[PDB]
Amino acid sequence: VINTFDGVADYLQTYHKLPDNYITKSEAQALGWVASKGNLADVAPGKSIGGDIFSNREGKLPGKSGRTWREADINYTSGFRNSDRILYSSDWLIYKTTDHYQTFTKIR
Amino acid sequence: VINTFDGVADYLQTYHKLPDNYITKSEAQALGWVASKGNLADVAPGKSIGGDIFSNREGKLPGKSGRTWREADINYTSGFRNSDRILYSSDWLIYKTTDHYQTFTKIR
């Protein structure tokens, strides 16, 4: 399983997709994920939430026409989701946040 | 320092090795390179990442039995790595990419 900042970052930039252990929120919900119950590991063992569009509401990440930002959970193993996320753009800029999308720093 | 597409391309085809300013990722990591910190120029001034095996996962580069593909960074001087790479085979076909290995074109 690849779920570290560095592992996922390098996987994205080379292969241009998330590793196989990622599923979107929508897919997780379809498998019976109930966020308020913290049960992702029961209904999808070994998987992490990732791949969803990050709207970048506060325009904190560098915006450009045609650039799309996505997120993925980092360091997740079980229970409620943590506060760690990788943010990656369609042109493979990679940022990280450890504080629930409050601050971002560049890692690739 | 030789770190341009044309300079490295011609060096490879004549001398059949990278110029001296190249080190592999493994060597860089051993010198204290931390990719997420963008610090290669601090721990190895004047050097660029290059020499590593490129697995050619998406079979985008022309494959053949016994042909090995390697990569090297191009145009790097400091900070995080850029998106520019030379791809060279063991029989000295030279390709370039400027978009993180998404597209390749022939230069020698």
Curated annotation (Swiss-Prot), chains A, B:
Free-text biotechnology note from the record: Introduced by genetic manipulation and expressed in male sterile maize and rape by Plant Genetic Systems and in radicchio rosso by Bejo Zaden. Barnase expressed in transgenic plants will specifically destroy the tissue(s) where it is expressed. After cell transformation, protein expression and plant regeneration, the active nuclease destroys the pollen producing organs thus rendering the plant sterile.
The keyword Chloroplast is assigned to this record: no
Effect of H100Q: Loss of activity
UniProt keyword Signal, yes or no: yes
Ranges that cross the membrane: none
GO MF annotation list: RNA binding; RNA endonuclease activity
Active site: E71 (proton acceptor), H100 (proton donor)
Swiss-Prot/TrEMBL keywords: Endonuclease, Genetically modified food, Hydrolase, Nuclease, Secreted, Signal
Broad class of enzyme this protein falls into: hydrolase
Role: Hydrolyzes phosphodiester bonds in RNA, poly- and oligoribonucleotides resulting in 3'-nucleoside monophosphates via 2',3'-cyclophosphate intermediates.
Name this polypeptide is given: Ribonuclease
Organism, as annotated: Bacillus amyloliquefaciens
Full-sequence portion shown in this chain: 50 to 157 of 157
